[PDB]
């Protein structure tokens, strides 16, 4: 087992990782910005290093500073969390180059999946169903581009290969807009990722966002841990996630999960990973792969019993997966509500000092947050300050537990989305289940 690790992150995920370390007897090094001295996990860590001032470029994205902290503390490994440098292949390469373990896949694997064109070709080759598309980069030849669009069928979508999070992608519904759409997406891709490579996909009008959790170790073991529905979103920001996905039969779960695990074996994947799919008309279509642990990982943990962060640390230490596939069983239902320090009318971050705090409790209630009474939410980072996860023996009990828990949650002094989450829980269509990726924006529009 790993002696000591640096937690190269902040807020809730850093505390999540810290708890996992402590359970395993792993010494913790909290690296933090000058704005993050009073973070709960920093306060609980065995060692702390201030790695720079508030802005992330000089703290949590500061590669030399994070590596130096691992060096000076005698840490053997670095957990990147999610966000920041977790999908940075150059960072992971530098970590291993410097002699430390990067808690994730190989840098080659990160780089493969961070290139959307190459990642798709690898999945399609491995037997994972993908969106009908160009199966290759789009050139500058617009006669070819119109032919590819005719072949696929309008509507189509133009996407940056080096991009993510819906940044720079446009729907095209006819030839007349195609040239201009390609050109703009390409220009925005060059400006944002220094990679002007773009591709084309059939545009799916009303899909659900359903993703498969995987774990792969260094002994050839690769398993799937069911799915998450993350369709309840706004402007490419998830709001509610749940596991398993409503409507998904064990037969579908088996079908797509086995194909994801098979893909892991083919690519020599290691650690925790997520295969993202658009799900429409009973069909799965691969869009992209995340090589990190994700925000919404706790709902998967509730329904399988598997502690995914502890699995990450074991894999990195050279231990095999602590469970086998036939030992993985979907039990019950879990719902996650993201808690954001945000303005209700603008949806912009709403930082400030929390004056009164109370966390909910009870059976099946899980609160994932660093916040406390007296804590100041800094303006420099993401608005998400906490995660409320509620489990029940079925979906309805999970929703009922969520409502009660949201009504016990007190966070005064700052603006939050607790009232919105309450609205979503009481939403008749959510309560029915199976609402598509566009539902929340349509509901908010009304
Ligand atoms: N070919 C498609 N069709 C629909 C899509 C909806 C997408 C979508 C829109 C809004 C919310 C979730 C997914 C989406 N992504 C945005 C982030 C990367 C995947 N990609 C699509 N590709
Ligand atoms: Cl994430």
Residue 286 near residue 120, CB atoms below 8 Å:
yes
How many Å apart are CA 185 and CA 160, to the nearest integer? 7
Q: What is the DSSP letter of 150?
A: H
How many Å apart are CA 92 and CA 86, to the nearest integer? 8
Question: Ligand 1: does its nearest atom lie under 6 Å from the Cβ of 131?
Answer: yes
- 246 and 278 co-located in one domain: yes
Provide the number of structural domains found in the chain: 3
- 300 and 172 co-located in one domain: no
Q: Find out whether 215 is annotated in a ligand binding site.
A: no
Q: Find out whether 443 is annotated in a ligand binding site.
A: no
Instruction: Report CA-CA distances (Å) from 298 to 305, 312, 376.
Output: 10, 14, 25
Residue of 43, 28, 112, 118 lying closest to 291 (CA atoms): 112
Residue 235, judged by CB atoms within 10 A of its CB (0-12, 13-18, 19+), counts as exposed
How many Å apart are CA 364 and CA 360, to the nearest integer? 11
Cβ-proximal residues to 297 (8 Å cutoff; 6+ apart), any chain: 213, 272, 308, 309
- 74 and 52 co-located in one domain: yes
290 alpha carbon – ligand 2 mean position (Å) = 8
Show which of 54, 85, 116 is a domain's final residue. 85
- 302 and 233 co-located in one domain: yes
In this structure, the dihedral spanned by the alpha carbons of residues 63, 48, 301 and 120, taken in order and rounded to 10 degrees, is 0
Cβ-proximal residues to 109 (8 Å cutoff; 6+ apart), any chain: 267, 268, 269, 270, 291
Residue of 232, 283, 280, 292 lying closest to 259 (CA atoms): 283
Number of H helices, E strands in the chain: 15, 22
Residue 223 near residue 308, CB atoms below 8 Å:
no
Cβ-proximal residues to 116 (8 Å cutoff; 6+ apart), any chain: 159, 160, 161, 162, 163, 164, 199, 288
- 370 and 337 co-located in one domain: yes
Instruction: Report CA-CA distances (Å) from 229 to 296, 367, 436, 437.
Output: 10, 20, 10, 10
Q: Please list the residues that pair with 289 across neighbouring strands.
A: 275
- 326 and 253 co-located in one domain: yes
Q: Please list the residues that pair with 444 across neighbouring strands.
A: none
Nearest ligand for residue 232 CA:
1
How many Å apart are CA 303 and CA 93, to the nearest integer? 34
Which residues form the domain of 159?
Answer: 131-203
The CB-side HSE value for 356 (13 A sphere, CA atoms) comes to 4
Q: CATH no. for residue 427?
A: 3.30.470.20
238 alpha carbon – ligand 2 mean position (Å) = 9
Nearest ligand for residue 295 CA:
2
Residue 362 near residue 404, CB atoms below 8 Å:
yes
Pick from 236, 239, 276 the residue to mutate for probing ligand 1's pocket: most ligand atoms within 8 Å of its CB: 236
- 236 and 105 co-located in one domain: yes
Q: Please list the residues that pair with 171 across neighbouring strands.
A: 157
Residue 245 near residue 227, CB atoms below 8 Å:
yes
- Asked if residue 59 has a cis previous peptide bond (ω within 30° of 0), the answer is no
- 375 and 422 co-located in one domain: yes
180 alpha carbon – ligand 2 mean position (Å) = 32
DSSP character string of 188-234: HHHHHHS---EEEEEPPSS-EEEEEEEEE-TTS-EEEEEEEE---EE
Q: Find out whether 125 is annotated in a ligand binding site.
A: no
Show which of 52, 85, 118 is a domain's final residue. 85
Question: Ligand 1: does its nearest atom lie under 6 Å from the Cβ of 236?
Answer: yes
- 135 and 36 co-located in one domain: no
Helix (H, G, I), strand (E, B) or coil at 441: helix
For this structure, is 270 an active site residue? no
111, 292, 366, 401: the active-site residue: 292
- 59 and 106 co-located in one domain: no
- 187 and 212 co-located in one domain: no
Nearest residue (CA) to ligand 1, atom 10:
236
276 alpha carbon – ligand 2 mean position (Å) = 11
Residue 257, judged by CB atoms within 10 A of its CB (0-12, 13-18, 19+), counts as buried
Nearest atom in ligand 1 to 165's CA: 17
Residue of 40, 12, 28 lying closest to 375 (CA atoms): 40
Q: CATH no. for residue 69?
A: 3.40.50.20
Residue of 128, 135, 138 lying closest to 158 (CA atoms): 138
Chain breaks in the chain (C to N over 2.5 A) after: none
145 alpha carbon – ligand 2 mean position (Å) = 33
Helix (H, G, I), strand (E, B) or coil at 23: helix
CA 280 to chain centre: 21
Q: Find out whether 236 is annotated in a ligand binding site.
A: yes
Residue of 27, 29, 164 lying closest to 83 (CA atoms): 164
Question: Ligand 1: does its nearest atom lie under 6 Å from the Cβ of 209?
Answer: yes
Show which of 203, 234, 262 is a domain's final residue. 203
Query: This structure's resolution (angstroms)?
Result: 2.3
| Two tokens, residue 263 | 């893909």
Nearest ligand for residue 208 CA:
1
- H helix or E strand, kind and range, residue 130: none
Question: Ligand 1: does its nearest atom lie under 6 Å from the Cβ of 286?
Answer: no
How many Å apart are CA 315 and CA 270, to the nearest integer? 8
Q: Find out whether 27 is annotated in a ligand binding site.
A: no
Nearest residue (CA) to ligand 1, atom 2:
203
Q: CATH no. for residue 160?
A: 3.30.1490.20
- 235 and 376 co-located in one domain: yes
- Asked if residue 388 has a cis previous peptide bond (ω within 30° of 0), the answer is no
Residue 36 near residue 30, CB atoms below 8 Å:
no
Strands 198-202 and 156-160: antiparallel
Pick from 287, 436, 438, 442 the residue to mutate for probing ligand 1's pocket: most ligand atoms within 8 Å of its CB: 287
């Amino acid at each position: 087992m790993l002696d000591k690790i640096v937690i190269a992150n902040r807020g809730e995920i850093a505390l999540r990782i810290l708890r996992a370390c402590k359970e395993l007897g792993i010494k913790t090094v909290a690296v933090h910005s000058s704005a993050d001295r009073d973070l709960k996990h920093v306060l609980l860590a065995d060692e702390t290093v201030c790695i720079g001032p508030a802005p992330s470029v000089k703290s949590y994205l500061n590669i030399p500073a994070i590596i130096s902290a691992a060096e000076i503390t005698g840490a053997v490994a670095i957990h990147p969390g999610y966000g920041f440098l977790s999908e940075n292949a150059n960072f992971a390469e530098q970590v291993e180059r410097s002699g430390f373990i990067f808690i994730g896949p190989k840098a080659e694997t990160i780089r493969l999946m961070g290139d959307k064109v190459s990642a798709i070709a690898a999945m399609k080759k491995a037997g994972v169903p993908c969106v009908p598309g160009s199966d290759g980069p789009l050139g500058d030849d617009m006669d070819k581009n119109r032919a590819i669009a005719k072949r696929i069928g309008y509507p189509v979508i133009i996407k940056a290969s080096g991009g993510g999070g819906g940044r720079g992608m446009r729907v095209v519904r006819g030839d007349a807009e195609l040239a201009q759409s390609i050109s703009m997406t390409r220009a925005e891709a060059k400006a944002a990722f220094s990679n002007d490579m773009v591709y084309m996909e059939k545009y799916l009008e009303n899909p659900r966002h359903v993703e498969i959790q995987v774990l792969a170790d260094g002994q050839g073991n690769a398993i799937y841990l069911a799915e998450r529905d993350c369709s309840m979103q706004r402007r490419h920001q998830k709001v509610v996630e749940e596991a398993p996905a409503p409507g998904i039969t064990p037969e579908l779960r088996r079908y797509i999960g086995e194909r994801c695990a098979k893909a892991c074996v083919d690519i020599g994947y290691r650690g925790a990973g997520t295969f993202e799919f658009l799900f429409e008309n009973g069909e799965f279509y691969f869009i992209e792969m995340n090589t990190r642990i994700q925000v919404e990982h706790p709902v998967t943990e509730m329904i399988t019993g598997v502690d995914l962060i502890k699995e990450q640390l074991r894999i990195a230490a050279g231990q095999p997966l602590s469970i086998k596939q036939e030992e993985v069983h979907v039990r019950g239902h879990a719902v996650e509500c993201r808690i954001n320090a945000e303005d209700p009318n603008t949806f912009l971050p709403s930082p400030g000092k929390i004056t009164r705090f109370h966390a909910p409790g009870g059976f099946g209630v899980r609160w994932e947050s660093h916040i406390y009474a007296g804590y100041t939410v800094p303006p420099y980072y993401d608005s998400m300050i906490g995660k409320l996860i509620c489990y029940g023996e079925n979906r309805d009990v999970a929703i009922a537990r969520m409502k009660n828990a949201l009504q016990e949650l007190i966070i005064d002094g700052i603006k939050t989305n607790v009232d919105l989450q309450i609205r979503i829980m009481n939403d008749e269509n959510f309560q029915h289940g199976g609402t598509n990726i566009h539902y929340l924006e349509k509901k908010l529009g009304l």
